[PDB]
Curated annotation (Swiss-Prot), chains A, B:
It comes from Homo sapiens. GO terms for molecular function: oxidoreductase activity; protein serine/threonine kinase activity. This is Protein HTATIP2. GO terms for cellular component: cytoplasm; cytosol; mitochondrion; nuclear envelope. Changing R102H: Loss of association with nucleus. Residues 1-21 are annotated as: Required for interaction with elongation factor EEF1A1. It is found in: Cytoplasm. The gene is HTATIP2.
Amino acid sequence: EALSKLREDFRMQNKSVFILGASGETGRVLLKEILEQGLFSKVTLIGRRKLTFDEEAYKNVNQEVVDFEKLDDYASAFQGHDVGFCCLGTTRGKAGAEGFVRVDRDYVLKSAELAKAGGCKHFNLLSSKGADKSSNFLYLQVKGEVEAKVEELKFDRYSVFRPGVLLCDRQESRPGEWLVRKFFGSLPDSWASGHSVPVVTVVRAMLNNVVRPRDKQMELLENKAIHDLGK
Amino acid sequence: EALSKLREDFRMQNKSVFILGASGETGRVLLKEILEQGLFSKVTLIGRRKLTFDEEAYKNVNQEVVDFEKLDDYASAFQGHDVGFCCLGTTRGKAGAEGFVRVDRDYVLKSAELAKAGGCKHFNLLSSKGADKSSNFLYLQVKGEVEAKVEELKFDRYSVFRPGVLLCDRQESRPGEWLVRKFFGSLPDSWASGHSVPVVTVVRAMLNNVVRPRDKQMELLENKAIHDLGK
Ligand SMILES: NC(=O)C1=CN([C@@H]2O[C@H](COP(=O)(O)OP(=O)(O)OC[C@H]3O[C@@H](n4cnc5c(N)ncnc54)[C@H](OP(=O)(O)O)[C@@H]3O)[C@@H](O)[C@H]2O)C=CC1
Ligand SMILES: NC(=O)C1=CN([C@@H]2O[C@H](COP(=O)(O)OP(=O)(O)OC[C@H]3O[C@@H](n4cnc5c(N)ncnc54)[C@H](OP(=O)(O)O)[C@@H]3O)[C@@H](O)[C@H]2O)C=CC1
């Protein structure tokens, strides 16, 4: 109800959004929810390849195909958007150690830099629970490092999300949750919420947050807060 | 290619199929793949509630809404199908201990009994890795018990599938796999396949198996075999 009011006010602001990582599993859910909620008057995807869609609402989605190795040459793709969401990410297994840093730190930071120069007022970064630039684990070290480097850009509003392992298709209430929980010991039915979170809940938290009036310059939501806001 | 030949031969046999648990996550993927592959000339869902669908192919799907507490009164719903798939299942958290036994053992066994009496020649049961009727863990004890009780019905062909924890949306190649694997230690990139499996792979294994000519009266596929056959 109050949230409904915030969404209406937000739609009246005629805001545009750009998304990095829309082809990914979190990104595709974010795009779908953005279209289902009709929060933005213009939606632009920025990525390495053109995507093909099903439903009709996708017909109005703009796509900017870029070469991340020469991103500066595609600076125009980052011009004029009010809000940005970054769901890009790879793994060491798929890209090697250096390739992982290249995507999760370099491409993300460069994109953020171009977005700031392009007028973006609210940048949203999908990070991970445990992000720590001092970590000895490459994945968490890089997440902590890129969080800090994007903070330095000083967006009017910067939101960092640190979800636990991403679930899908109600895994949290299906038999697999019982099997995993039992493997770890005699635990309470709410144990899973501490280390995991459904991707739809993460997206709902991101969009419920986007319609709240800007307050603090930097917001960082840990897994519990994501569960609470993504209700 | 050889598999393509088996599928063609199977379609020429004009077989009908019934599915229990089509509303579930594995069941819905099984139904979708059955329609996409066009393996059966008649598809019937048996369950506690009527389901509503999207795509056109679902228009020919028959639905039998039954009361599992009085299943004998719905014996006609099990009449005449050649193949049956059971993807029913609940949890202790959702149904309590007795309620879990009621669904996973009682409803499943009763359904199998009615299917056998109804002429079903090939019954497929979705069980779990670790199923053991002697287990001290309720979930695995019940899975092991119902596997044995259905074996006693002596279907012409009985296939039991024991998948590890069910994944979805490429979780096996996304960052969550790296996080979970690292939590467990320094492990090889193929570690996850030993304890988990994508639901689509499970369904593909089930359907690749269904088109193979009957050989042994009972077949039991463990997680590795499911990964291999569900390629
Ligand atoms: N999955 C999980 O459990 C968790 C994930 N995270 C974080 O959330 C974010 C999203 O994760 P998730 O949705 O699972 O990721 P996915 O693997 O589903 O999506 C990854 C995205 O990044 C893009 N990408 C990857 N490599 C490149 C590249 N070399 N060049 C250009 N684009 C690239 C992909 O594009 P393309 O389709 O072209 O490859 C895709 O859009 C990541 O930053 C991840 O670290 C946080 C907590 C847990
Ligand atoms: N998820 C996992 O990781 C694993 C699952 N398994 C096994 O695979 C099977 C399928 O699992 P999964 O797809 O995740 O399950 P889901 O929870 O997605 O689906 C469960 C199904 O059982 C039906 N069901 C549950 N309770 C009742 C009831 N009281 N009366 C009638 N129908 C009921 C559901 O119907 P409705 O929609 O009406 O509730 C639904 O069709 C289960 O037997 C599970 O134990 C095996 C290995 C791991």
